[PDB]
Amino acid sequence: TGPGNRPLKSLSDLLKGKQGRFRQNLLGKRVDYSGRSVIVVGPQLKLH
Amino acid sequence: WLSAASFQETTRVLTDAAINCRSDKLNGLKENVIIGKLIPAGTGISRYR
Amino acid sequence: FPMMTEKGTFIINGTERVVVSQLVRSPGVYFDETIDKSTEKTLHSVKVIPGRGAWLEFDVDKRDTVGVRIDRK
Amino acid sequence: EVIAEHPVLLNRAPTLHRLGIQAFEPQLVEGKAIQLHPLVCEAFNADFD
Amino acid sequence: AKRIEAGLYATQKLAELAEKGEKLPVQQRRDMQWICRDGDRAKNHLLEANLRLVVSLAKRYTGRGMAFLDLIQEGNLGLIRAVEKFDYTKGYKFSTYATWWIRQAITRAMADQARTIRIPVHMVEVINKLGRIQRELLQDLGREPTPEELAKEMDITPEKVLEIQQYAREPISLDQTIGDEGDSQL
Amino acid sequence: VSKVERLMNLVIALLSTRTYLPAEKIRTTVAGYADSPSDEAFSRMFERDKNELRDLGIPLETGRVSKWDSTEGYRINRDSYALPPIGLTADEAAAVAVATQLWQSPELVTATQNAVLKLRAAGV
Amino acid sequence: LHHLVDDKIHARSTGPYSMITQQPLGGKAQFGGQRFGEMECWAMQAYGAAYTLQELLTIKSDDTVGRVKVYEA
DNA sequence: TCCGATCGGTACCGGACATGTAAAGAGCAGACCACCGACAAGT
DNA sequence: ACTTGTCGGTGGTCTGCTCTAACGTCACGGCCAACCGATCGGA
């Protein structure tokens, strides 16, 4: 453990878990040209 | 071994693969997603590419 | 020593903060009963839970032998 | 001029099936909220709350 | 101690007579080898018998960066040095010279091998002195002492104190959790 | 190159710097100091150049790089370099006309000529 | 209620990236990108859109040369 | 056959951040730097 | 005559190594506390 009684992070801890290398950084990433916002209803729009 | 390690029990899978000296052939959805190749389904198959 | 204001908040580093009361289990003796699915018999146990101390547990098993587990041994 | 006939993909988490990601043709609106068609909510499992 | 000194002298004399010397008698060579081996065994026995004071000395330095076993090993090195420098003619017991050397070795090692960014010992001493003076000033004044008071009570410029305080920062970890759950890191 | 070029380049560089430039950077940056055989010839030459500049009158200050830096460099205070403002013009004409008439001592005439040249460089 | 669109709307084309893995940051306060998680990858695989998924994974997140080449193109 | 014990796993987005102590002190030496002498040979 | 490179010196700060003689001798600060299924090493 280090300061605050927090166990140190080894290589296996890098490679394992949901927060590990594989699941967090290889099967899913953050991408450019992307946005996010609240949705409201537009009834005058077409299906496309 | 790449898909098995990405799925669950990374340490055991890596140990067994290292001891067995396995060689991944890189033909599947998960491996091609990981390495950056087109998945072998949909528009990524040889007939359509 | 930090002092609480007249409204129940602490000014720490210029920011008002609130200490939230915590619901915990009071120390004491607690008796529990379970039913085994391998023999269909009732088994009782008691746990002494102190504050800042070792744990003392007594239990009754299938063989009707009362057993104490000092600490977690 | 630039957004005409340029589809964009809309996604709502969690993505439970394919219809959680759908392509739409964008139109500029004056607000700050995305206007969604009322008939694609069931596919997205989305409500306006 | 006498056995150690006799063994060392016998080894040196045997080495001197080996090169540019003379054919030693067989019994003389056997006796020299026996004395050397006895001296080595006596040194090992003294070391092993005194490998309990080291733990007592290192018990007091626990929780200051280094681990307990590392402190014990550095104390063992200090004990080896103390055995090498112990003189029996003065009549003092081994527990004083050994204590001095063990404490010196532990303190020096903890000065070196305890920081990710290494600071020389001559500056670690200054940092510790500044901290002690700050504690004394805090006790005396009743309030937190300003750099002015430390400058007067440490006979240094009121600017070097800022550099000393800025050299004492320890780097934080990039792997520490940010949120309440375990999904965020610094 | 030329000694005069080295001196002029050093003066300009030490005038335009913002922090205390160390001698190691002076060797690589200032032209004319990079042709020395070894580090001792450069050191002695730079010491002599500093002595000459300080004796001339140009303010050459030596001080720390910065608070948290133990390196020691050199600068030239642009504010102490000279005094811009000048007085009237009619009195200066009389002063120049009487600057030197019959003095023969080389130090006196050189000093008067230097003062006249500086006055001309600061207006008439 | 304290849920206003002014605090929710966010968009990005190119911004800061991470250090170990050269992927975009996250959060409105850091001009970060939107996560394309594993479920979205499953949806893309089920659709059969190989090229969209490939470009999303490679040239929008990690391909260091690819990002600048795409912007120039 | 029963038996404790270790080891694996437990949905998604949005956001949110940085620690709290030291028992000291001295004598001796090499290195680099800022200031200087000579000094003959080269300019 | 002026410059310049090799030689030699004084003084100062940062860094590292060595030494100090009453007697001293076998660590702590602290949970763990879900709850499931699978499986190897015991009994």
UniProtKB/Swiss-Prot annotation, chain A:
Query: Which superkingdom?
Result: Bacteria
Q: Which residues form a coiled coil?
A: none
Q: Which family does it belong to?
A: Belongs to the RNA polymerase beta' chain family.
Subunit structure of this entry? Answer: The RNAP catalytic core consists of 2 alpha, 1 beta, 1 beta' and 1 omega subunit. When a sigma factor is associated with the core the holoenzyme is formed, which can initiate transcription.
Cited function? DNA-dependent RNA polymerase catalyzes the transcription of DNA into RNA using the four ribonucleoside triphosphates as substrates.
| Protein name per its UniProtKB record | DNA-directed RNA polymerase subunit beta'
Q: What is the originating organism of this protein?
A: Mycolicibacterium smegmatis (strain ATCC 700084 / mc(2)155)
| Portion of the full sequence shown | 392 to 439 of 1317
UniProtKB/Swiss-Prot annotation, chain C:
Q: Note on file?
A: Mutations in the RRDR sequence (residues 423-449) confer rifampicin (Rif) resistance. Rif blocks transcription initiation but not elongation.
Q: How does it assemble?
A: The RNAP catalytic core consists of 2 alpha, 1 beta, 1 beta' and 1 omega subunit. When a sigma factor is associated with the core the holoenzyme is formed, which can initiate transcription. Interacts with RbpA, which partially restores Rif-inhibited transcription.
Q: Provide the family line.
A: Belongs to the RNA polymerase beta chain family.
Portion of the full sequence shown: 148 to 220 of 1169
How is this protein named in the record?
DNA-directed RNA polymerase subunit beta
Species assigned in the record: Mycolicibacterium smegmatis (strain ATCC 700084 / mc(2)155)
What functional role does this protein have?
DNA-dependent RNA polymerase catalyzes the transcription of DNA into RNA using the four ribonucleoside triphosphates as substrates. This subunit often mutates to generate rifampicin (Rif) resistance. Interaction with RbpA partially restores Rif-inhibited transcription; once the subunit is Rif-resistant however RbpA no longer stimulates transcription.
Curated annotation (Swiss-Prot), chain D:
In this entry, which stretches build a coiled coil?
none
Residues annotated as binding Mg(2+) are: 47, 49
Q: What does this protein do?
A: DNA-dependent RNA polymerase catalyzes the transcription of DNA into RNA using the four ribonucleoside triphosphates as substrates.
Q: How does it assemble?
A: The RNAP catalytic core consists of 2 alpha, 1 beta, 1 beta' and 1 omega subunit. When a sigma factor is associated with the core the holoenzyme is formed, which can initiate transcription.
Concerning its family, UniProt says: Belongs to the RNA polymerase beta' chain family.
Protein name in the entry? DNA-directed RNA polymerase subunit beta'
Q: Which species does this protein come from?
A: Mycolicibacterium smegmatis (strain ATCC 700084 / mc(2)155)
Q: Which gene encodes it?
A: rpoC
Measured against the full-length protein, the chain present covers: 489 to 537 of 1317
